[PDB]
Paper text:
The ReAV enzyme from Rhizobium etli, a representative of Class 3 L-asparaginases, is sequentially and structurally different from other known L-asparaginases.
In the S48A mutant, the zinc cation is only partially present at the metal binding site, with a refined occupancy of 0.7, as is the water molecule from the zinc coordination sphere. The loss of Ser48 from the Ser48-Lys51 tandem affects the conformational state of Lys51. The Oγ atom of Ser80 no longer interacts with the Ser48 hydroxyl; instead, this interaction is compensated by an H-bond to an additional water molecule, which likely mimics a water molecule of the triad. A negatively charged sulfate ion, derived from the crystallization solution, appears in the close vicinity of the metal binding site, forming H-bonds to the Nη atom of Arg47 and the main-chain N atoms of Gly188 and Cys189. The role of the primary nucleophile of ReAV has been recently assigned to Ser48. In agreement with this postulate, substitution of Ser48 with alanine rendered the mutant protein inactive, as the L-asparaginase reaction could not be initiated.
Numbering used by the authors:
A (entry chain B): -4 to 353, 357 to 367
B (entry chain A): 2 to 352
Write the structure that this text describes.
Amino acid sequence: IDPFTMTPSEDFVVTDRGGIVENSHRVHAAVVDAKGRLLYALGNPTRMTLARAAAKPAQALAILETEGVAGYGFDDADIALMCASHSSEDRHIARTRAMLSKIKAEEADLRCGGHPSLSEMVNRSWIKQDFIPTAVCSNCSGKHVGMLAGARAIGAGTDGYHLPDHPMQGRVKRTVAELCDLDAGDVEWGTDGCNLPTPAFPLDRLGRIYAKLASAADGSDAGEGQSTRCAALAHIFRAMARHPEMVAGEGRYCTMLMRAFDGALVGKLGADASYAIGVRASDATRQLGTDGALGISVKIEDGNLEMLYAVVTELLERLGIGSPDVRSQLASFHHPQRVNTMGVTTGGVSFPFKLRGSVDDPRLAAVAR
Amino acid sequence: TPSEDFVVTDRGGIVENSHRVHAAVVDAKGRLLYALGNPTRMTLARAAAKPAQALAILETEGVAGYGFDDADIALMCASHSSEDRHIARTRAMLSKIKAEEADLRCGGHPSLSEMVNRSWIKQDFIPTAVCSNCSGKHVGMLAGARAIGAGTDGYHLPDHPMQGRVKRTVAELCDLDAGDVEWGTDGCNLPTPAFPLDRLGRIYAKLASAADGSDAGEGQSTRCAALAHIFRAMARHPEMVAGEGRYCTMLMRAFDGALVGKLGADASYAIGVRASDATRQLGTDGALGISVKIEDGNLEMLYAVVTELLERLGIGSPDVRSQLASFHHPQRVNTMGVTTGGVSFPFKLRG
Ligand SMILES: [Cl-]
Ligand SMILES: [Cl-]
Ligand SMILES: [Zn+2]
Ligand SMILES: [Zn+2]
């Protein structure tokens, strides 16, 4: 009610029914440069956050930096599937089996389990057949095959490749902290749905990982000499952008986003409503005030995915990233339909949040909340 | 100032999501006894308003002649799972009023029970009007429109006398002026009210209080008698109010007449508790009402919080509440059988 005392604690996405507030959801977001400097924020941009599957490009880097993995001949689409929370479409299952074959492993070697598909259409096909998904159907199956590959390549057991004491998980933990530029004690660890260790760290550092992806892609495309790590980051970016259907699937936000942007960015979902985007240097990033790549990370405090995709699409519009025509491929996510059982629209979504970082009285405190 | 009351989920002790909780616990006159969050938050009651809409139906002149029974009234109060038995009862109620499915003005939707919906998907079933979770309410409004000789084609429109009756009855049960109730449109295409959350608790306290007064042989107005009947119908036929496995059904079965409870979509909940040792211990001499809203709309968190609140209020025994253990602490087990996290209730009741 007072535009001059607005605060991070008031950064919301709200749904209404005939103008009456239905639900409200707190938003947190960080927009960072290629070194992690914070450029813009919503909510608490340093919120300690479970990255969930948005950490997968970092886990893929740990796989690709494992000595001997290159000999298996994983291609870009295989790397994309390592980075994926796929919809368990037949092509994802088939590629998982092909990756198994490249390392001479079997489905029984996987330590992830089946689950209902992340795609409603795939799940409808499974329901019709009373199909029970198995390990090879896991949305994380590509990451698991990559972890198996790394365990085999260094001569570790494949037994227990998913456990924290295994050297593959030691490599993951170190790689995540290094990409975030954190000490190990500033990264916390739980266990994911796919039964791997999964990291939590300040939300802005998830943005920093993705800014580093995009920055590495810029350096590779420009022909700059790169470290082995930067070359591997550039390869991960390229793989995701070239095979975005491996990263998610038909009708999925990550796939539709990356297809619409045609190489300009990569993006990835984390469960419980986190999202991360790495944006290559562009006219839009320069207008935001940086000379290199950019990273964006978002968390919806209560975990609602429909709201996450609406907010991410709104934030891209506010940041001037893309064109209206590019972002219009995402219109169904930006303003989710609210049509009742008789075809009547009953309400909608609104975005009463305010990006900070672009000028207010110096006496307005922005308390991260 | 409202407290900062949350339910919080974790993964290995690391915070995953948090959800703001609003709750009101009120006496039979609506006086606020305990609260979480903002107990007066303006809130869409959604289907938690259905007992008030059922009252408007039952008070309509001539509706008694159709011979609706207790299970029919329960289905008027329902957000049912569209099980075959709910559809069958909808058709039986249509027949009682000499109407047809084509007269309904609600539409089909995926079932509120995931198990039912999977069964529909396997069979390529397209739900129709008679499968609406609100089908019983719609048959009741048809019945009221026909009973007073109003048109049936537009019984769902705000300008129809049945909707005028509903709008008046809701404000009267809330003890609000008409202008203090706001109205939107529900999923089933009826007008749907919003009012302060504590007033939703007040409606359910009046249900339970009427059940107590009928049980006790008090001189009741026709309205209190009808409220008592609604309470009794819900408690006697809780499977009509929701369905197998649903929180409302399991809650009411566990309590065996001691309370009624009802879900509103987007995570509101209302309970009417008959006077008991537990209510007297809370400091009231009559019935009480409980209303809850999860700010972000998460249903799993709603049922966890409602069950936690019952435990904090002492309502029921530990043995009775243990039937709801699966809702109180939702399972957090991964695809390989490993427990990955849990739910916590850092909130504190304000008295
Ligand atoms: Cl919402
Ligand atoms: Cl949650
Ligand atoms: Zn995983
Ligand atoms: Zn309805």
